[PDB]
Design a protein around this ligand. Structure first.
Ligand SMILES: *[C@H](c1[nH]c(/C=C2\NC(=O)C(CC)=C2C)c(C)c1CCC(=O)O)c1[nH]c(C[C@H]2NC(=O)C(C)=C2[C@@H](*)C)c(C)c1CCC(=O)O
Length: 168
């Protein structure tokens, strides 16, 4: 992004993704997990039910992405875990999730111009949860559609700047 209210319409889109995301799933938390150039994630938007810890504006350094999964998620990999305490996750992984009281999560990728911008992640905090096919599909389409909008909004801004500059 080149700013100048690009970041404005972006945040509005992130907020829509998390709001409609948690509404859809009726889960406890939905966040937008954005990467930097080193693929360190930051929660830039969060919808969370009352009584649960807010994960908003939190920097979480997880190396597994840059080391293993960046390309996979770029290809549209989805990860649905019914119970995080029975998925063979290590303690270091769990310690990131416990303060957020996570019991089950659904991870779908946000791909913008063939780059893994980030992840749309949903949390169930009260108890385990088997995510249904219809839920996974709609949730993935929510993430990818939002990403496509961001993608085409950016090219639109670049086209507008280009056309105005070269105008006779
Ligand atoms: C890979 C991995 N990390 C995450 C991170 C998150 N889950 C969430 O719910 C949230 C929002 C709070 C985040 C962020 C996920 C979902 C995955 C799975 C990717 C996939 O399988 O598609 C991962 N990270 C770790 C942490 C551990 N490994 C380390 O080297 C160090 C250091 C750690 C402690 C910080 C682990 C164990 C995994 C899974 C193993 C792997 O696939 O690499």
């Amino acid at each position: 992004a080149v700013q100048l209210s690009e970041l404005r319409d972006r945040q509005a889109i992130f907020e829509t993704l998390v709001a409609k995301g948690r509404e859809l799933l009726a889960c406890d938390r939905v966040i937008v997990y954005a990467f930097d150039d080193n693929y360190v994630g930051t929660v830039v938007a969060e919808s969370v039910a009352e009584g649960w810890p807010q994960a908003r504006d939190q920097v979480i350094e997880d190396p597994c992405f840059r080391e293993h999964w960046v390309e996979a998620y770029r290809q549209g990999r989805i990860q649905a875990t019914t119970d995080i305490f029975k998925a063979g996750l290590t303690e270091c992984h769990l310690n990131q999730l416990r303060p957020l009281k996570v019991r089950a999560n659904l991870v779908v990728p946000m791909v913008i111009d063939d780059q893994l911008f980030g992840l749309l992640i949903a949390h169930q905090a009260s108890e385990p949860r088997q995510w249904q096919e219809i839920e996974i599909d709609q949730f993935s389409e929510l993430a990818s559609t939002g990403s496509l909008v961001l993608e085409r909004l950016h090219f639109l801004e670049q086209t507008i700047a280009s056309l105005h500059h070269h105008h006779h």
